[PDB]
Design a binder for this molecule. Structure first.
Ligand SMILES: [Mg+2]
Ligand SMILES: [Zn+2]
Length: 201
């Protein structure tokens, strides 16, 4: 089972925090039939939707962890099951989503019966898409702690985060990196079934 009725209602109310006509980036880590990290980002307000999912196929996950996202699967055991379907079900009707390489996003959305959502494929080159990568992690690394493993290429590389990807691709297309305080749309008790409280220093 997934979200309770009150979680669904809380989620429906939280989605009103998105502007259904504003620019909205989306990115995922993992394959579209088996995603482990999902992010949606509205640069205009700073609002973002960001959550995690436990993988079905461990073998593919462990390859993605080594070559892409660096996520330790044990850190996904406490995620809310069914959240991916509930968030996508809840997205505003006929909203427009921007992505870098729309194919994976499109397959995800279509698998959930959301063909009404229009996609904008930004099609940045590899190097252009990551031109603000280091700056984006430095400004915003506190927003995602889930990329704990070392990630390699065909040489070590900075892990890929669906949320950092949205921020840096928007900056690359906008032609600079804004100073904006971002804000999580989903409550933390929705993202994780059991969650660590804020650290008391
Ligand atoms: Mg990406
Ligand atoms: Zn991340």
């Amino acid at each position: 089972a997934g979200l309770t009725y009150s979680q669904l209602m809380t989620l429906k109310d939280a989605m009103l925090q998105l502007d259904p006509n504003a620019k909205t980036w989306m990115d995922i880590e993992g394959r579209p039939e088996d995603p482990v990290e999902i992010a949606l980002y509205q640069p205009s307000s700073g609002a973002y939707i960001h959550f995690f999912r436990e993988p079905t196929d461990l073998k593919q996950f462990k390859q993605d962890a080594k070559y892409s996202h660096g996520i330790d699967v044990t850190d996904l055991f406490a995620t809310q099951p069914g959240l991916t379907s509930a968030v996508i079900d809840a997205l505003p009707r006929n909203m427009v989503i921007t992505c870098q390489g729309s194919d994976d996003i499109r397959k995800l959305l279509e698998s959930q019966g959301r063909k009404d959502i229009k996609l904008i494929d930004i099609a940045l080159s590899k190097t252009d898409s990551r031109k603000y990568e280091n700056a984006v992690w430095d400004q915003y690394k506190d927003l995602c702690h889930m990329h704990t493993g070392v990630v390699v290429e065909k040489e070590e590389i900075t892990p890929h985060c669906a949320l950092m990807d949205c921020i840096m691709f928007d900056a690359a297309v906008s032609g600079g990196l804004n100073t904006s305080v971002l804000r999580a749309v989903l409550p933390r008790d929705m993202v994780f079934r059991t969650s660590t409280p804020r650290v008391v220093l």
